[PDB]
Amino acid sequence: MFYGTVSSPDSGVYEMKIGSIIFQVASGDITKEEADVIVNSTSNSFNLKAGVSKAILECAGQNVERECSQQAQQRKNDYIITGGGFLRCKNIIHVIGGNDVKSSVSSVLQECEKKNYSSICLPAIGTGNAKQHPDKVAEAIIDAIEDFVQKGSAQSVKKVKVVIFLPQVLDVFYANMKKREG
Ligand SMILES: O=C(NCCc1ccncc1)NC1CCCCC1
Ligand SMILES: [Cl-]
Ligand SMILES: [Cl-]
């Protein structure tokens, strides 16, 4: 009851409506994206520096690294919200790559509504160091957005973009979108 048609605005880039949200996928470097929130896929200690998290932490800067460790030594966090540092965003949300991906995405969406944010950019959460399977990750990300729309929760959020390091993972996301199209 929610999905539009899959189309391609540029070479290797794909989009479809899910209710009121435009869902987009593309392969590339997530550290040169602009969005209200950029998501980092990290460890349960919020200090992973390998793969996409290496790139995010080095570009964001030592003040963001400091924010992560400061917050990690206060309570048991499922995820952590920091400033964007020298990334082009208002906040970074650091999620645990090994956690349930649907749950992690649902939390990001809810935190973005709380701040009246309109745009989100995320990696293929959990497919790096955590070694979750790409089609299970794609299914979980898109399911989280469907549930958020079904509940009438999308108000400020208008665009959700997955920027994916490996082209082979981009191909898996495309196939999952085609399976759902209306
Ligand atoms: O894939 C890589 N490095 C490739 C370079 C790269 C990766 C991501 N973002 C920018 C540059 N390392 C992997 C990460 C997962 C754990 C085992 C090492
Ligand atoms: Cl990725
Ligand atoms: Cl990961």
Q: Is 47 helix (H, G, I), strand (E, B) or coil?
A: coil
Q: Which residue's structure tokens are 């469907």?
A: 146
| SS3 state of residue 151 | coil
Return phi, psi of residue 174, to 5°. Answer: -55, -50
Q: Please, how many CA atoms are within 13 Å of residue 158, restricted to the half-sphere of its CB?
A: 6
Q: Give the structural domain span for 161.
A: 1-182
- CA 95 to ligand 3 centroid distance, Å: 9
Cα dihedral sign, 138-140-143-148: negative
> Would you state the structure tokens that stand for residue 154, as one six-digit string?
């999308």
Tokens read off for 40: 């980092």
Where would I find the H helices in 115-158? 134-150
Mutate to test the pocket of ligand 1, among 32, 41, 52 (most ligand atoms within 8 A of CB): 52
Angle at which helices 134-150 and 101-114 cross, to 10°: 40
Determine the Cα–Cα distance for residues 73 and 60; give it in Å rounded to an integer: 20
Q: How many domains does the structure of the chain reveal?
A: 1
CATH, residue 42: 3.40.220.10
Q: How far is CA 35 from CA 3, 12, 47, 128, in A?
A: 23, 20, 22, 22
Ligand nearest to the CA of 97: 3
Ligand 3 geometric centre to CA of 19 (Å): 28
Half-sphere CA count of 135, side-chain side, radius 13 A: 5
